[PDB]
Amino acid sequence: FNCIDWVHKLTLEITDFDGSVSTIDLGASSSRFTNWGSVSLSLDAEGISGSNSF
Amino acid sequence: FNCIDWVHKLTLEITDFDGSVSTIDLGASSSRFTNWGSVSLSLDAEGISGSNSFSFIESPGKGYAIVDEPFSEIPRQGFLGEIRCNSESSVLSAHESCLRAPNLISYKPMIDQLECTTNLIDPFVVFERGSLPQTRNDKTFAASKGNRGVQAFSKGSVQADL
Amino acid sequence: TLMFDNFEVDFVGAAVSCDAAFLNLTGCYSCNAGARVCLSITSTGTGSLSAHNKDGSLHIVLPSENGTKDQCQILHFTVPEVEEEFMYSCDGDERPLLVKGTLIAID
Amino acid sequence: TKFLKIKTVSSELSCREGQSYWTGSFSPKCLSSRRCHLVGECHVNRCLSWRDNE
Amino acid sequence: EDPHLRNRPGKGHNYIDGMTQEDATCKPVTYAGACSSFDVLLEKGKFPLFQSYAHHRTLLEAVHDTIIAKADPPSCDLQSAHGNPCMKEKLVMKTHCPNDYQSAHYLNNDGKMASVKCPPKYELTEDCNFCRQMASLKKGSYPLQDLFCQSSEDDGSKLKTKMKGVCEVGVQALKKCDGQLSTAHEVVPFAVFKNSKKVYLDKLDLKTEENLLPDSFVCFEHKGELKSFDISQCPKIGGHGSKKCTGDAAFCSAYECTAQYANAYCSHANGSGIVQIQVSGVWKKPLCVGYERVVVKRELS
Amino acid sequence: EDPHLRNRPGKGHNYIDGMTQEDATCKPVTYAGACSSFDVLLEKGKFPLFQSYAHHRTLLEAVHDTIIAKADPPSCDLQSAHGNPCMKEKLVMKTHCPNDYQSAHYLNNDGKMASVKCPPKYELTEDCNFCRQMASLKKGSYPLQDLFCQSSEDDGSKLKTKMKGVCEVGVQALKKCDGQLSTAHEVVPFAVFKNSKKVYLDKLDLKTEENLLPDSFVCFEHKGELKSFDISQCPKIGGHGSKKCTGDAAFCSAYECTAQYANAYCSHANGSGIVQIQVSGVWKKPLCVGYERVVVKRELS
Amino acid sequence: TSAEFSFVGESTTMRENKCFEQCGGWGCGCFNVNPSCLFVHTYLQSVRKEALRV
């Protein structure tokens, strides 16, 4: 396979109020549904361009 | 949308002889219909040239905006308009009559798990980033004061014949 | 960005007591990481200990259990000579507690 | 006072996949079958102009 | 290979109190007879989910197997006095009723089994709200949903309807809608758990896993395609039983085939197993996942 | 167009004084019968404006519904000696009508009901300007225009015809042309408001909306084909009525939701009730707007 | 020519028929959530009194 963009992924370990532990991830601007709601990545800056030649 | 020509529009009202007032408009060399004849414009004024490399954003019931980017006729990825339609109901409900770019939804099959993450471009970021009024060259682009459409405020005089 | 979609959160008023003890302090100030603090919480039941400073800018909440456990979180400061007194409370009544430690300059 | 801890593992840059395909090694296995001329379907024109799908 | 659409696992009963006059040909349900509450379930182009899930229980079979609770009253009258409790939760149910059928049941928002009927001589209209005058009256219950039942006791009282952009669906008051309401009908699936209510879900994920359950095979009767045969009379592995029945590797892997001494050619059922739904990102065991048309009052202002 | 072609709401009477010889099939007007003063209105390629809006009343139906008044005389004699009042208003109209007709009603200048009458057995010609001596003669009248009656409460007496450069249009006379005069065969629509005259307009702009009047809602009962039912008997919210009725969100939003105690299934019309016209920039609801074919006498000097 | 403007007839002047999409619902004068339509029958007319031969 190939790659067109380096999405900055941040593996987050969401800890609920009762004590539930859930490990997820956020990239670019996508959201992940949880039990309390949905967290998403806001402003980004870290990015690498030039992956079509690999 | 985009702007291909700047028509010199003048909001002119007509006060009839009896007392009735009718507010109309005249652009370039257009004509209207009243209760006593026909009004028209013979000479325009000024004229902004070169607007094919710019686009505007209109919001129903809200302000306007401007984008410093040329318009593209084909829906491609990474462009302000990768998923287009034809009406507001076709966007709020995602009607099948709209167009989109092929191979846009990223699929991650995991035996029994499915995760579809798309890198959709949020138009509200550009709408809130470049919102009118905006200072462009010597002119000042702003919203409209009557009919729905993009307008422009100049700093010259009025040289026209009715 | 954390968006909530109507999530009910309940809480039970705990009434257990726990005495916290200072351990050490190693980290940095005015940096992205912070300063890791070490606390020795000794309680007799399973609850939750709450701690805070004086002006109300710092808050420390650590899970309290039955026995002596070493807990702590990462705190942020803007001074290498941290001498802020904390007020920890296991059920409502606060207790005096002073911390100290030498930090390093890092971004 | 209750906290909503969101633990961060590390800063990663995931790649956005697109066009992908599977590949591997293979080994052809040929079969020999010689038949004399004018026997069944043994001809000169049928041997020179032969279709692979048939 | 292809499982039949009439072999009902378990008891195979499709009747309810008050409209049980069809118990002569609907208790149990087999090739002999014509049950009114099962003929419309096999119509092509009407209930695709019931045709996809062949060897699976229904709502009535779940009621008879002590799975889904019963309402009170379970069979109310339409032309009765003092109003009708079986109408406030049915009016928001956008369904359709053909002809002939007199009674109709529906899965209410209380997680119970409710049904309405009209006194003779009155049948159902185009929807099934009031009665009218007209041929014959099929003494049964016309189904208004496309749900499937299963034997499970998974508790799920900590899960409720948490749809986005929905103010109040059906009769259950979700969130406080201070603005206006967009009263309109649409399509939306749902799932009912144990000791809970009718939880509505916008999206769902179905999972099928094959096991060695007796309700995951089918056999064709013969002397000693073709017709069906009762699989409960087949012996187990390492033992004996009533009659005999052989099969391939799938049917022989769980039971024991007697070859020439068998009377039914068993085979694997291509459409069974345990069906689980995914709610809130956690796989759970549902009890009645349907797909009807309800009145969803979305936001507007 | 409109699906309701022969079904006429309310009374549906199409008979004029002096030609009451078709009340057996035109009183009321249903799918059956043969009314000569209604069959020619639904002809393809003749009166498309009547086919576009067919849920409202006609001219005679508006006269019988206490909407359009009657002239004097309402039905003039087109054969009596010493002239007749229905002559100048007919010679200025260039309309066509088939043979075997005796009467031909139209609209006068005061917005009343002016028509002609032919004594038996005298038939009309191709233009209808004069009668003549005598298959079977029609027992009714022929609509010379293409208008529909409706109930409105919008005043428009000051909105007189302002056709500039025209001496005499249709039947009314704006002034006395003493110099040049250009006579041509042009089509000009007309509109009649409340307490006004036959106002002529250039362009025609239609508008379709709904309201809460019983005329904008239809209903049918269920019995052992299509059977009409009086929708005016549906009770209101918190009021009284006669027979109950239920429907969808459009019909239930206007009346009271009954469902279990309803006797019919009410529905919503296909856009009818209030038809406004765009005149003087604003939107007003006329009474009998049409699109006739007359002779317009424009000026020149 | 649509059925909404077929009452005029086959004219011998310059004209055109355009169909523009409009929103529906109860907010614009409708009883269904489906989008409505707007039939346009605009014809050209002369407003002057003379003519020019270029």
Author numbering:
A (entry chain H): 850 to 903
B (entry chain F): 850 to 1011
C (entry chain H): 1012 to 1118
D (entry chain H): 742 to 795
E (entry chain E), F (entry chain C): 154 to 287, 290 to 379, 393 to 469
G (entry chain D): 796 to 849
Give the published text.
Rift Valley fever virus (RVFV; genus phlebovirus, family Phenuiviridae) is an important example of an enveloped virus that harbours a class II fusion protein. As with other phleboviruses, RVFV displays two glycoproteins on the lipid bilayer envelope of the virion, Gn and Gc, which form higher order pentameric and hexameric ring-shaped assemblies. While the Gc glycoprotein is responsible for membrane fusion, the role of the Gn remains undefined. Virus entry is completed upon Gc-mediated fusion of the viral envelope and host cell membrane, in a pH-dependent mechanism.
Localized reconstruction of each of the four types of the Gn–Gc capsomers (pentamers and hexamers of type 1–3) resulted in four independent structures at resolutions between 7.7 and 8.6-Å. Imposing lower than six-fold symmetry (two-fold symmetry for the type 2 hexamer and three-fold symmetry for the type 3 hexamer), or no symmetry (type 1 hexamer) gave the highest resolution, suggesting significant deviations from six-fold symmetry in the hexamers. We first performed fitting with the localized reconstruction of the pentamer at 7.7 Å resolution, followed by fitting the resulting Gn–Gc heterodimer model to localized reconstructions of the hexamers at 8.0–8.6 Å resolution. Consistent with previous biochemical and structural studies, this fitting verified that the Gn and Gc assemble as heterodimers, which form higher order ring-like pentameric and hexameric capsomer structures on the mature virion. Domain A of the Gn forms a ring on top of these capsomers interacting with domain II of Gc, occluding a surface area of ~950 Å2. The Gn–Gc interface is formed between the β-ribbon domain of the Gn and the hydrophobic fusion loops of Gc11, which are shielded from solvent at the interface between Gn domains A and B. As the N-linked glycosylation displayed on viruses is unlikely to be obscured in protein–protein interfaces, mapping of putative N-linked glycosylation sites onto pentameric and hexameric Gn–Gc capsomers was performed to validate the model. This analysis revealed all putative N-linked glycosylation sites to be either solvent exposed (RVFV Gn Asn438 and RVFV Gc Asn794, Asn1035) or facing unoccupied density that could partially correspond to an ordered glycan (Gc site Asn1077). Interestingly, the embedding of the fusion loops was only observed in the case of the pentamers and not with the hexamers.
